[model samples]
Target chain A: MRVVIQRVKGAILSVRELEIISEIKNGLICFLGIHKNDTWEDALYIIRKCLNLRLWNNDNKTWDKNVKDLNYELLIVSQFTLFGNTKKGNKPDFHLAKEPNEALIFYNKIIDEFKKQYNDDKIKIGKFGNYMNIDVTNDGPVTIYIDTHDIN
Target chain B: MRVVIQRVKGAILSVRKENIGENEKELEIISEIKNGLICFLGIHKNDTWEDALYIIRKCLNLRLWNNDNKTWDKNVKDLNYELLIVSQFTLFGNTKKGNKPDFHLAKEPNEALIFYNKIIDEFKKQYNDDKIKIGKFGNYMNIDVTNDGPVTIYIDTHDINL
Candidate 1:
């Protein structure tokens, strides 16, 4: 599993002709990826870290507020493309990713478990396997990365 | 493996003598609970189906968005919920998000991955036994949860005007 975390001021998700637009304030945006080797353990490890890491702190060594402290909202998006391998060659290779069938199971497992834990009605998400036009004005462009293999 | 997908407009993670402020243009946050841990997925997928699914459509389907077509932005402080921060900067920092970590492994990966692990360790003390949180930062947040379960849906960027 891999993910990108960002702190944002506000955001919007809209479909051209649709009258609906999804927006959020004072929240964190996350991009998630799943590899074949990812397991329940990886999921647990990542979640605990996201909910507790103190990203906000002063140079004085004072503990800054947490995600909860900021009342940070979240946006979860699935990014299978992250698994693509384009290093050795120009063409991207996705042979390492889980097959759709296998991926479906893994994806479901993660979603089912998320609902079971924090039953927050405020959660929002996007469509799977579809194209989307997203506009994000990143705040300081502050970003972070995470993976399951490196459990350091 | 369920994930909580949230969209944030503005987010700020900072500290001040008496106040700190952070803002996010737009964020999609996903949370998944497994065994005893809670996982948060970040959506970093760009220009792909998985990214589209995880960041945009799921939130709409779940009604997490406001009736006026705007999604809800959650204030971490308001919830009084304590959450660990896993800095998965590589997911988006990497030029490419696929293949082997070696190809995409950038400066942020080493530090981000280490931070990710450390946060988990710290969470154990905060949440007691059998509990955790996981997820990617940006595009990755769109996957897992959006692809899974009965509530899942499919949306395309082409479907949007902007």
Candidate 2:
């Protein structure tokens, strides 16, 4: 599993297939993905990381603040393109991405786990398996990329 | 220089960036154009709403394909080509603001979309609402233009001298 986390001032979720819209303020916008070889353990590892990682900074020497400490909201988006590989020719190879049916289990796990930690009111989502657009006002313009398997 | 036209089959524009209204499908498929044009249009900050007409005129008459038979003489009018019009704000995306591109040069959504819709409505009522398929305005969309003939052409409003 992999994720790109951006500290954002605000974010809005537009339900394109339908007229409904949703939004969040003062939080992080995360683009997430799953790999074919990933397991349930991987999902557990990443969700914990998303809630606890201290990518924010500038108050002191140590990046000692996590989302839990700040109580920031989260806008999580499911994007299969994280697994895209353009290593060979111009076209990106998508074999690394897990199939939708297989991937949804883990994707939902992150959001569900996040809500447990932060409560449902603090969580926002991009439409699963749909081409939904996200408008992000990325504050701090601070962006970080992490992979669940990279550390271990 | 600001407009992109591609001959397509089965084009779809699914909403991504805007609020989807009640009972609207996130994906509006241009099933009408079995073999016609899918156009991506970008409006500049200084571009007048009327500028859309110049772009429309070029689209209706550009000579690029055949009349189902012999020669290269047939134009869009001759073929009664289906059109899938899309509004793109990224055409004016200025990249000088760090690595992330900025859309300050693109008109704001409220006005930009109004102009975009006007283009579609003014473009003749010449084709059936079905004949002229439209991408939802003010929304980020996943565009599917399987460019047949790999035949893609660029038209600029400025070049039209309108």
Candidate 3:
């Protein structure tokens, strides 16, 4: 699995009906991509990293605070496009992403684990397999990418 | 050099600044684009001009949009789209050591700011001057990005050579 964790002051997530599905303030907006061969271990690794990594400043000390330390929220969105392969051609090939049906189940499992590890009220999620528009206040604009496959 | 490009229907970037003789501050819009990409650019400590060029070319030339019925057939220039470039050094945050991520690999801010401006100018030169937009480097920014297709592409110039 691969995850792109972007630090944000806040974010508003909406769908086709123009209704707000979810929103978060002062936290991380995570774009998660499940690999075709990703396992539970991959999901666990991403969860630990996202909650523990220090991407904030504290007492003038840069990169000294995590989201949990600040009591921030998290907006999780499924993003298969992160696996979009552009190396072979100009067009992206998403052959490496897990299928939507199966990935949804996997994604839900991960989300549940996130709440279990953190607080239930602190986690927000986007609708699976739907078009979404997110207005993000990018604080520090701090972006982090992790591919659990590289752990070996 | 590294860049994270996201397809967007539109984006608005703003910054807050202190007002003269007053403790109050006002929010000002720095850059805005109707339809295009928001690129989060990270400059490496060892990155050279070649790496910058590689990223600039890819951002303009990559076919991230569809043309008529043909998917991924048109580059940003082909559609007369815009690009919002923001300097994001945190992409180099290395978490391999522990929970406290470090940024020793990222380019220094003073030098990277100059390098980032040059890249922005080059982007305008290659594409259209009016089509390129930018954020306040090394400053706090609030961006409202309306993602279309929610498509994202990542490029690391160090992974290859010129």
Candidate 4:
């Protein structure tokens, strides 16, 4: 399991009239990648990490505030290509990405966990394993990487 | 030259349109495919026709799974799979920058369609009319992919230019 969380001023990605985007003034946009070995625990951990990771400033430049403290939005988008392995050839082999039905279940659980704490709208989303056109203006330009193998 | 392909048991493209005067909305299933490959074609400014053929040939030939072996041993050519093509430009977004990814390397909108449509035309040469289904180029569309063996792969055409 891996995720790329970017702090954003705002972001928008739409398909026809169905726009999967953010209305938050401040928040995080994340690209989530799931591997075959990932467990339900991994999903639980990443969500906690995204919410608790130190991202905002307390002083002139102190990373003391977290998303929960600020009540910022969290935009989680499903990304499968992060598991791409291109060492052998130009072809990126995704032999290890999560299966569809399993991933759908995982996505549902991820939101279920978030909904328990934050307001439902605080957890923004992109379609699970779908094609989308996204536009994002990253705030603070703060992007962090979180993987199940390493979390501190 | 980056193309994402999946050996799919089936696929569906769902388009949700809002009713301008009413409180209701309609979900339209635009394109559907079965027993084939679905290709999300992303165009770069540097991509050429050579890259097009390279990616298309790989799509119709990547061996994944079959009924007999239950292993990654059968190509789409052998399985006689159909094709679903979707246009995506974000594949070339440069993530090295600040909050927003820079899409400078992607083809412009009008030019992108020319490139995308050309690809659709080339990809069609390999299959009959019924064997080919397409997503609207550069529009907001939803795709549901049911993978046969959960098999997916990506092709990077940038390597060919170098």
| Top candidate, metric TM-score | 3
lDDT string, candidate 3, B21-128, tens digits: 697888888789999999999999999999999889889988988878998888899999999999988788888679987789999999999999999999999999
lDDT of each: 0.43, 0.63, 0.89, 0.68
TM-score of chain B of 2: 0.78
Model 4 / residue B158 / CA error / Å = 0.9
How many collisions per candidate? 172, 7, 0, 5
Give per-model CA RMSD: 18.1, 14.4, 1.7, 10.9
Residue ranges of candidate 1 with Cα displaced over 4 Å: A15-21, A57-63, B1-162
lDDT of 4 at A98: 87
Q: Candidate 4 lDDT, tens digit per residue, B1-162? A: 676665666777766678886966876778888778877677888778888887777776666555585654667667777788877665565533332345688888898888778877777777565677887666556555554433446567765543
Q: Which portion of correct inter-chain contacts appears in model 1? A: 0.06
Q: How much of the true contact map at the interface does candidate 3 reproduce, as a fraction? A: 0.70
State which candidate, 1 or 3, has the greater TM-score.
Answer: 3
Q: What is candidate 1's lDDT per residue for B55-78, written digit by digit as tens?
A: 222322223122245432222222
TM-score of each: 0.46, 0.47, 0.94, 0.55
Give the per-residue Cα lDDT of candidate 4 at A100: 84
Rate residue B50 of model 2 by lDDT.
55
**Superior candidate under TM-score, 1 versus 2:** 2
Among incorrect, acceptable, medium and high, the docking class of model 2 is incorrect
Q: Write the per-residue lDDT of candidate 3 for residues A2-111, one digit (tens) a residue.
A: 88898998999998858888999999999999999999999999999999998888987978889899999999999998888766666778999999999999999999
Query: Mind giving the per-residue lDDT tens digits that candidate 4 earns over A1-152?
Result: 87766666666655435554434447777777888888878888777777776667778855567877887888777777657665354445777788889888887888878777667878887767665655554343344555576543
lDDT string for model 2 (B27-74, tens) is 443233556777767787788865776677667766657555844355
Order of candidate numbers by lDDT, starting with the best: 3, 4, 2, 1
